[PDB]
Amino acid sequence: MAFLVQVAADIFNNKVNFELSFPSRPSISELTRSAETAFSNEISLRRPDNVPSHKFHSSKIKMYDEELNKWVDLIREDQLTDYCQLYVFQPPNEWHKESQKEIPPAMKPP
């Protein structure tokens, strides 16, 4: 009865995996406030409260469809196509060392 979408990110500092469900309100401003907050929610938990939690925004976004089993570009207001899975890209700041994991609930850095 419910329609669902998934959102994730790639930064050598924060690597996140989240699950989101739509009842009867499919808008695009819905994806950018959810994903940009996923990364900022990782920074705000590490440092205490009352102090700034940096400024984080999305750079390049791609949409994967498991029906044709291939990567396609992000469409707006019609973003829920056959559930649809999302991955967000951002380049390194320091830590140039290689890493690999990915599991259904979201992961925290060591």
Structural domains for the chain? 1-110 (3.10.20.650)
Sheet containing 70-73: which strands, arranged edge to edge? 15-22, 3-10, 85-89, 60-65, 70-73
Alpha-carbon distance of 106 to 104, in angstroms, equals 7
Number of helices (H) and strands (E) in the chain: give both, helices first: 1, 5
Instruction: State the structure-solving technique.
Output: NMR
C-alpha 104, offset from chain centre: 13
Tokens 């401003």 -> residue = 29
For residue 82, give every residue at least 6 positions away whose Cβ sits within 8 Å of its Cβ, in sequence order, or none. 65, 67
The beta-strand segments (E) located in 1-110 are: 3-10, 15-22, 60-65, 70-73, 85-89
C-alpha 20, offset from chain centre: 10
